């Protein structure tokens, strides 16, 4: 019976660990959605840049929002964090204790 209880309780806590993993993964995905949207807008800008008769003043104009998009991307990357883990800012690996 005790050998059964040890498992039962451990797996009980492991379910919580798994849910925490779900939470963190969902948060990361949420940030990446925004990154993707901004990148797609950036591609739109680049395509606009290609028109033949554009003037260099227009090029600088486009450069403006280009800079804005990059700044926003970097801001999100740096600032976003979860439980003190600034997850997007580094290369890292973590293990969910499920077993």
């Amino acid at each position: 019976a005790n050998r059964f209880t040890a498992n039962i309780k451990g797996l009980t806590q492991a379910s919580r660990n798994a849910n925490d993993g779900i939470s963190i993964a969902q948060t990361t995905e949420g940030a990446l959605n925004e990154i993707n949207n901004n990148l797609q807008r950036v591609r739109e800008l680049a395509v606009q840049s290609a028109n033949s008769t554009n003037s260099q003043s227009d090029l600088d104009s486009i450069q403006a929002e280009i800079t804005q998009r990059l700044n926003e991307i970097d801001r999100v990357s740096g600032q976003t964090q979860f439980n003190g883990v600034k997850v997007l800012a580094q290369d890292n690996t973590l293990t969910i204790q499920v077993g």
Binding site: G30, E34, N71, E72, V76
Partner: protein, 50 residues
């Protein structure tokens, strides 16, 4: 205090064009600022939900 200049303003259209360029450049900058703010509030909403 602005002066009472003696003669006609020479090449006035260039002054007007420069002023218009300044104004429109500013407007574009503020539009980009609005874009940044929209992105930020969207991020805040998603992060708050999560």
């Amino acid at each position: 205090l602005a002066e009472a200049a003696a003669t006609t303003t020479e090449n006035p259209l260039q002054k007007i064009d420069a002023a218009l360029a300044q104004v429109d450049t500013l407007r574009s900058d503020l539009g980009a600022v609005q874009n940044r703010f929209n992105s930020a509030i969207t991020n805040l909403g998603n992060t708050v939900n999560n």
